[PDB]
mmCIF file of all heavy atoms in Angstrom:
data_model
loop_
_atom_site.group_PDB
_atom_site.id
_atom_site.type_symbol
_atom_site.label_atom_id
_atom_site.label_comp_id
_atom_site.label_asym_id
_atom_site.label_seq_id
_atom_site.Cartn_x
_atom_site.Cartn_y
_atom_site.Cartn_z
ATOM 1 N N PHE R 140 -107.001 61.304 -29.445
ATOM 2 C CA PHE R 140 -107.866 60.290 -29.998
ATOM 3 C C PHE R 140 -107.475 59.855 -31.278
ATOM 4 O O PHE R 140 -107.175 60.609 -32.116
ATOM 5 C CB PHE R 140 -109.487 60.846 -30.007
ATOM 6 C CG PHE R 140 -110.359 59.773 -30.341
ATOM 7 C CD1 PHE R 140 -110.887 59.016 -29.495
ATOM 8 C CD2 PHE R 140 -110.717 59.548 -31.592
ATOM 9 C CE1 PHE R 140 -111.793 58.069 -29.713
ATOM 10 C CE2 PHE R 140 -111.695 58.611 -31.868
ATOM 11 C CZ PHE R 140 -112.243 57.846 -30.918
ATOM 12 N N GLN R 141 -107.472 58.544 -31.499
ATOM 13 C CA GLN R 141 -107.189 58.014 -32.896
ATOM 14 C C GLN R 141 -108.355 57.120 -33.332
ATOM 15 O O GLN R 141 -108.971 56.436 -32.470
ATOM 16 C CB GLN R 141 -106.004 57.288 -32.849
ATOM 17 C CG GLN R 141 -104.780 58.178 -32.405
ATOM 18 C CD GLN R 141 -103.782 58.072 -33.618
ATOM 19 O OE1 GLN R 141 -102.659 57.449 -33.493
ATOM 20 N NE2 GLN R 141 -104.006 58.825 -34.657
ATOM 21 N N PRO R 142 -108.650 57.178 -34.559
ATOM 22 C CA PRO R 142 -109.570 56.263 -35.138
ATOM 23 C C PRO R 142 -109.131 54.848 -34.868
ATOM 24 O O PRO R 142 -107.930 54.579 -35.092
ATOM 25 C CB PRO R 142 -109.623 56.541 -36.643
ATOM 26 C CG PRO R 142 -109.111 58.000 -36.609
ATOM 27 C CD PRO R 142 -108.112 58.235 -35.505
ATOM 28 N N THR R 143 -110.093 53.912 -34.650
ATOM 29 C CA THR R 143 -109.788 52.591 -34.385
ATOM 30 C C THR R 143 -109.428 52.295 -32.865
ATOM 31 O O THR R 143 -109.057 51.291 -32.430
ATOM 32 C CB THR R 143 -108.852 51.955 -35.307
ATOM 33 O OG1 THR R 143 -107.481 52.437 -34.963
ATOM 34 C CG2 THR R 143 -109.040 52.360 -36.684
ATOM 35 N N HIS R 144 -109.377 53.388 -32.147
ATOM 36 C CA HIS R 144 -109.153 53.123 -30.652
ATOM 37 C C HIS R 144 -110.250 54.000 -29.921
ATOM 38 O O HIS R 144 -110.572 55.009 -30.535
ATOM 39 C CB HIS R 144 -107.702 53.349 -30.387
ATOM 40 C CG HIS R 144 -106.726 52.600 -31.374
ATOM 41 N ND1 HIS R 144 -106.629 51.220 -31.311
ATOM 42 C CD2 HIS R 144 -106.210 53.060 -32.441
ATOM 43 C CE1 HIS R 144 -105.818 50.884 -32.237
ATOM 44 N NE2 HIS R 144 -105.606 52.066 -33.044
ATOM 45 N N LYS R 145 -110.629 53.612 -28.656
ATOM 46 C CA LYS R 145 -111.873 54.096 -28.194
ATOM 47 C C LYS R 145 -111.728 55.235 -27.268
ATOM 48 O O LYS R 145 -112.674 55.982 -27.030
ATOM 49 C CB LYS R 145 -112.516 52.894 -27.550
ATOM 50 C CG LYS R 145 -112.665 51.725 -28.605
ATOM 51 C CD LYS R 145 -113.467 50.508 -27.959
ATOM 52 C CE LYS R 145 -113.390 49.496 -29.066
ATOM 53 N NZ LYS R 145 -114.165 48.212 -28.819
ATOM 54 N N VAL R 146 -110.438 55.507 -26.871
ATOM 55 C CA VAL R 146 -110.174 56.381 -25.791
ATOM 56 C C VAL R 146 -109.494 57.657 -26.106
ATOM 57 O O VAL R 146 -108.640 57.789 -27.120
ATOM 58 C CB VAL R 146 -109.384 55.640 -24.589
ATOM 59 C CG1 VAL R 146 -110.234 54.478 -24.078
ATOM 60 C CG2 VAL R 146 -108.077 55.300 -25.133
ATOM 61 N N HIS R 147 -109.731 58.793 -25.475
ATOM 62 C CA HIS R 147 -108.997 59.984 -25.551
ATOM 63 C C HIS R 147 -107.766 59.709 -24.610
ATOM 64 O O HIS R 147 -107.732 60.258 -23.516
ATOM 65 C CB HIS R 147 -109.735 61.207 -24.999
ATOM 66 C CG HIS R 147 -110.788 61.683 -26.057
ATOM 67 N ND1 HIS R 147 -111.952 61.046 -26.147
ATOM 68 C CD2 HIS R 147 -110.559 62.673 -27.008
ATOM 69 C CE1 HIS R 147 -112.511 61.710 -27.235
ATOM 70 N NE2 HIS R 147 -111.899 62.622 -27.661
ATOM 71 N N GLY R 148 -106.867 58.870 -25.107
ATOM 72 C CA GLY R 148 -105.891 58.415 -24.212
ATOM 73 C C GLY R 148 -104.408 58.248 -24.804
ATOM 74 O O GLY R 148 -103.456 57.601 -24.253
ATOM 75 N N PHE R 149 -104.259 58.856 -25.922
ATOM 76 C CA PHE R 149 -102.986 58.627 -26.624
ATOM 77 C C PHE R 149 -102.023 59.827 -26.513
ATOM 78 O O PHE R 149 -102.418 60.781 -25.891
ATOM 79 C CB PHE R 149 -103.292 58.371 -28.219
ATOM 80 C CG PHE R 149 -103.836 57.077 -28.530
ATOM 81 C CD1 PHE R 149 -105.104 56.773 -28.150
ATOM 82 C CD2 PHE R 149 -103.019 56.230 -29.290
ATOM 83 C CE1 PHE R 149 -105.604 55.418 -28.465
ATOM 84 C CE2 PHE R 149 -103.514 54.945 -29.654
ATOM 85 C CZ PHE R 149 -104.742 54.563 -29.144
ATOM 86 N N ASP R 150 -100.815 59.634 -26.973
ATOM 87 C CA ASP R 150 -99.641 60.586 -26.944
ATOM 88 C C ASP R 150 -98.981 60.847 -28.215
ATOM 89 O O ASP R 150 -98.275 60.004 -28.717
ATOM 90 C CB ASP R 150 -98.716 59.845 -25.918
ATOM 91 C CG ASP R 150 -97.570 60.926 -25.717
ATOM 92 O OD1 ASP R 150 -97.311 61.823 -26.476
ATOM 93 O OD2 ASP R 150 -96.694 60.498 -24.911
ATOM 94 N N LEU R 151 -99.260 61.984 -28.757
ATOM 95 C CA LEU R 151 -98.751 62.239 -30.187
ATOM 96 C C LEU R 151 -97.173 62.248 -30.122
ATOM 97 O O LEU R 151 -96.535 61.937 -31.136
ATOM 98 C CB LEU R 151 -99.311 63.494 -30.652
ATOM 99 C CG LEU R 151 -98.910 64.071 -32.088
ATOM 100 C CD1 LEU R 151 -99.199 63.088 -33.097
ATOM 101 C CD2 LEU R 151 -99.498 65.413 -32.382
ATOM 102 N N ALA R 152 -96.623 62.717 -28.988
ATOM 103 C CA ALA R 152 -95.136 62.764 -28.910
ATOM 104 C C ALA R 152 -94.520 61.451 -28.864
ATOM 105 O O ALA R 152 -93.590 61.109 -29.734
ATOM 106 C CB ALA R 152 -94.707 63.526 -27.608
ATOM 107 N N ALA R 153 -95.039 60.644 -28.051
ATOM 108 C CA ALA R 153 -94.645 59.185 -28.067
ATOM 109 C C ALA R 153 -94.728 58.546 -29.519
ATOM 110 O O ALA R 153 -93.838 57.854 -29.950
ATOM 111 C CB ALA R 153 -95.406 58.250 -27.196
ATOM 112 N N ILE R 154 -95.904 58.864 -30.222
ATOM 113 C CA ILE R 154 -96.069 58.424 -31.460
ATOM 114 C C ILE R 154 -95.146 58.923 -32.586
ATOM 115 O O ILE R 154 -94.649 58.222 -33.362
ATOM 116 C CB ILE R 154 -97.523 58.669 -31.945
ATOM 117 C CG1 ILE R 154 -98.582 57.948 -31.268
ATOM 118 C CG2 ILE R 154 -97.656 58.206 -33.524
ATOM 119 C CD1 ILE R 154 -99.968 58.335 -31.356
ATOM 120 N N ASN R 155 -94.945 60.209 -32.402
ATOM 121 C CA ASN R 155 -93.855 60.842 -33.207
ATOM 122 C C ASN R 155 -92.505 60.099 -33.049
ATOM 123 O O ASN R 155 -91.833 59.925 -34.053
ATOM 124 C CB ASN R 155 -93.770 62.307 -32.781
ATOM 125 C CG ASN R 155 -94.806 63.173 -33.476
ATOM 126 O OD1 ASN R 155 -95.456 62.888 -34.311
ATOM 127 N ND2 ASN R 155 -94.625 64.357 -32.941
ATOM 128 N N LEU R 156 -92.185 59.727 -31.787
ATOM 129 C CA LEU R 156 -90.874 59.116 -31.711
ATOM 130 C C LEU R 156 -90.772 57.674 -32.102
ATOM 131 O O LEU R 156 -89.773 57.253 -32.799
ATOM 132 C CB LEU R 156 -90.452 59.178 -30.145
ATOM 133 C CG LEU R 156 -89.949 60.414 -29.604
ATOM 134 C CD1 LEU R 156 -89.738 60.281 -28.054
ATOM 135 C CD2 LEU R 156 -88.972 61.119 -30.299
ATOM 136 N N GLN R 157 -91.831 56.854 -31.855
ATOM 137 C CA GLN R 157 -91.856 55.570 -32.417
ATOM 138 C C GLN R 157 -91.956 55.621 -34.091
ATOM 139 O O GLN R 157 -91.382 54.670 -34.582
ATOM 140 C CB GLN R 157 -93.269 54.860 -31.894
ATOM 141 C CG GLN R 157 -93.228 53.331 -31.978
ATOM 142 C CD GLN R 157 -92.653 52.735 -30.888
ATOM 143 O OE1 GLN R 157 -91.677 53.216 -30.275
ATOM 144 N NE2 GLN R 157 -93.106 51.527 -30.508
ATOM 145 N N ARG R 158 -92.575 56.507 -34.575
ATOM 146 C CA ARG R 158 -92.671 56.572 -35.975
ATOM 147 C C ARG R 158 -91.306 57.033 -36.747
ATOM 148 O O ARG R 158 -91.094 56.830 -37.975
ATOM 149 C CB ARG R 158 -93.578 57.731 -36.446
ATOM 150 C CG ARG R 158 -93.990 57.670 -37.861
ATOM 151 C CD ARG R 158 -94.806 56.506 -38.332
ATOM 152 N NE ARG R 158 -96.157 56.519 -37.833
ATOM 153 C CZ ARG R 158 -96.990 55.441 -37.682
ATOM 154 N NH1 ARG R 158 -96.563 54.257 -38.172
ATOM 155 N NH2 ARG R 158 -98.169 55.605 -37.187
ATOM 156 N N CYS R 159 -90.425 57.672 -35.937
ATOM 157 C CA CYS R 159 -89.158 58.193 -36.283
ATOM 158 C C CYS R 159 -88.259 56.904 -36.495
ATOM 159 O O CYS R 159 -87.737 56.650 -37.497
ATOM 160 C CB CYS R 159 -88.550 58.982 -35.144
ATOM 161 S SG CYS R 159 -87.443 60.297 -35.438
ATOM 162 N N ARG R 160 -88.446 55.967 -35.538
ATOM 163 C CA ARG R 160 -87.817 54.767 -35.570
ATOM 164 C C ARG R 160 -88.342 53.698 -36.590
ATOM 165 O O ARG R 160 -87.561 53.233 -37.374
ATOM 166 C CB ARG R 160 -87.883 54.050 -34.184
ATOM 167 C CG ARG R 160 -86.933 54.838 -33.178
ATOM 168 C CD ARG R 160 -87.211 54.556 -31.813
ATOM 169 N NE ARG R 160 -86.665 55.435 -30.941
ATOM 170 C CZ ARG R 160 -86.801 55.349 -29.638
ATOM 171 N NH1 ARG R 160 -87.398 54.270 -28.962
ATOM 172 N NH2 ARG R 160 -86.157 56.290 -28.756
ATOM 173 N N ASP R 161 -89.774 53.662 -36.724
ATOM 174 C CA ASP R 161 -90.412 53.013 -37.751
ATOM 175 C C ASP R 161 -89.888 53.262 -39.269
ATOM 176 O O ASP R 161 -89.696 52.405 -39.925
ATOM 177 C CB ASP R 161 -91.848 53.265 -37.576
ATOM 178 C CG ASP R 161 -92.738 52.726 -38.746
ATOM 179 O OD1 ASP R 161 -92.282 51.627 -39.359
ATOM 180 O OD2 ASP R 161 -93.741 53.361 -39.136
ATOM 181 N N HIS R 162 -89.519 54.600 -39.372
ATOM 182 C CA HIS R 162 -88.975 54.997 -40.608
ATOM 183 C C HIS R 162 -87.465 54.952 -40.828
ATOM 184 O O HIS R 162 -87.092 55.219 -41.909
ATOM 185 C CB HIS R 162 -89.422 56.539 -40.844
ATOM 186 C CG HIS R 162 -90.876 56.660 -41.227
ATOM 187 N ND1 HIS R 162 -91.274 57.604 -42.282
ATOM 188 C CD2 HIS R 162 -91.915 56.223 -40.726
ATOM 189 C CE1 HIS R 162 -92.569 57.530 -42.327
ATOM 190 N NE2 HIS R 162 -93.077 56.724 -41.474
ATOM 191 N N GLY R 163 -86.807 54.394 -39.938
ATOM 192 C CA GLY R 163 -85.346 54.203 -40.053
ATOM 193 C C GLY R 163 -84.559 55.534 -40.114
ATOM 194 O O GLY R 163 -83.625 55.606 -40.854
ATOM 195 N N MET R 164 -85.011 56.400 -39.299
ATOM 196 C CA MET R 164 -84.392 57.760 -39.336
ATOM 197 C C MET R 164 -82.923 57.732 -38.697
ATOM 198 O O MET R 164 -82.749 57.245 -37.690
ATOM 199 C CB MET R 164 -85.265 58.798 -38.521
ATOM 200 C CG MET R 164 -86.399 59.457 -39.226
ATOM 201 S SD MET R 164 -85.849 60.303 -40.750
ATOM 202 C CE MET R 164 -86.168 59.018 -41.938
ATOM 203 N N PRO R 165 -81.860 58.273 -39.388
ATOM 204 C CA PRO R 165 -80.684 58.663 -38.714
ATOM 205 C C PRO R 165 -80.921 59.491 -37.516
ATOM 206 O O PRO R 165 -81.854 60.333 -37.439
ATOM 207 C CB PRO R 165 -79.831 59.332 -39.857
ATOM 208 C CG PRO R 165 -80.440 58.768 -41.020
ATOM 209 C CD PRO R 165 -81.962 58.761 -40.857
#
């Protein structure tokens, strides 16, 4: 669950990977 979204429907692993990219990680 994340604030600003309504559902117990998210994926922390997916988010971790997207954020990896967001941050320009080698």
Side-chain angles (χ1 to χ4, degrees):
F140 186 86
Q141 298 239 254
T143 74
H144 312 282
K145 309 184 180 187
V146 300
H147 284 84
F149 284 71
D150 179 350
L151 180 61
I154 293 164
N155 277 349
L156 292 178
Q157 200 84 331
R158 191 66 73 197
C159 210
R160 288 164 199 184
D161 173 30
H162 285 224
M164 277 301 98

